[PDB]
Design a protein around this ligand. Structure first.
Ligand code: A68
Lengths: 99, 99
C-alpha cells in the first residue's frame, strides 16, 4: 500500500497467532512490542530513545505478518508506549519513504 | 526521492542558518529538534517516548526546508539526541510510506 501521514501509520500485525495494532516507525532502528508472551529463548537487552533507556527481552528470528507482508526477525518486548515496527522489519517488507 | 530503510533515514534540513541532519520519522507525531536558541515566543510541553518524557519548547509557524522542500509549522526544541522530522511536516512535503 501507499500510506499517507495525516494520521499515525497504524497497521494490524499477526504474531504468535495473535492480532495487534502497531506503528510503522521509520525513526526506530528496532521493533519493540508491548509486554506479551512469545515462545522460545530470549536475552536481556537495553534500548534507548527520546526519554532514556529501557530494559527489553530480545527474541530472535520471530515471524510477524505486517499488513499482509511476511517478516521474520528480531522482536524486542518491553515497556514501549506503543507497539512499534522498526527498520529491521520495515526493510524486510520492502517499505520505503517517498516524496 | 525514494529513501530505503537499511540505514536511518537522515536528510539535511534548514532552519535558520543551521543546516542540520534530521530523521524522517513516521513514528513521530511532532517535529523535535536538538537544543537551539530560536527567536520568538514559545510554550512549554512534555513529550514522551522510550524511556519516558522530556521537556521541550514549542515554537509555532517556523519555516523549515527539508531536502529542498519548504515546510512551515510547529517545532519542538529540547534535549533530544537526534533531530526528528515528524508527521506534521512530513505531510507538508508529500511524504508517504510505500510497500
Ligand atoms: C528502537 C528503540 C526506539 C523505539 C527508537 N530508538 C532508536 C535508537 O531507534 C526510538 O525511540 N525512536 C524514536 C525516534 C528517536 C530515535 C533515536 C533517539 C531518540 C528518538 C521514534 O521514532 C519517535 N518517538 C515516538 C515513538 C517511541 C512512539 S519519539 O522520538 O519519542 C517522539 C515522541 C513524541 C513526538 O511528538 C509528540 C515526537 C517524537
Amino acid at each position: 500500500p501507499q500510506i499517507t501521514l495525516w494520521k499515525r501509520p497504524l497497521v494490524t500485525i499477526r504474531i504468535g497467532g495473535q492480532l495487534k495494532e502497531a506503528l510503522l516507525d521509520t525513526g526506530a532502528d528496532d521493533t519493540v512490542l508491548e509486554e506479551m508472551n512469545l515462545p522460545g529463548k530470549w536475552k536481556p537487552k537495553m534500548i534507548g530513545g527520546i526519554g532514556g533507556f529501557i530494559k527489553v527481552r530480545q527474541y530472535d528470528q520471530i515471524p510477524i505478518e505486517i499488513c499482509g507482508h511476511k517478516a521474520i526477525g528480531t522482536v524486542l518486548v518491553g515497556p514501549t508506549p506503543v507497539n512499534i515496527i522498526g527498520r529491521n522489519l520495515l526493510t524486510q517488507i520492502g517499505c520505503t519513504l517517498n516524496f
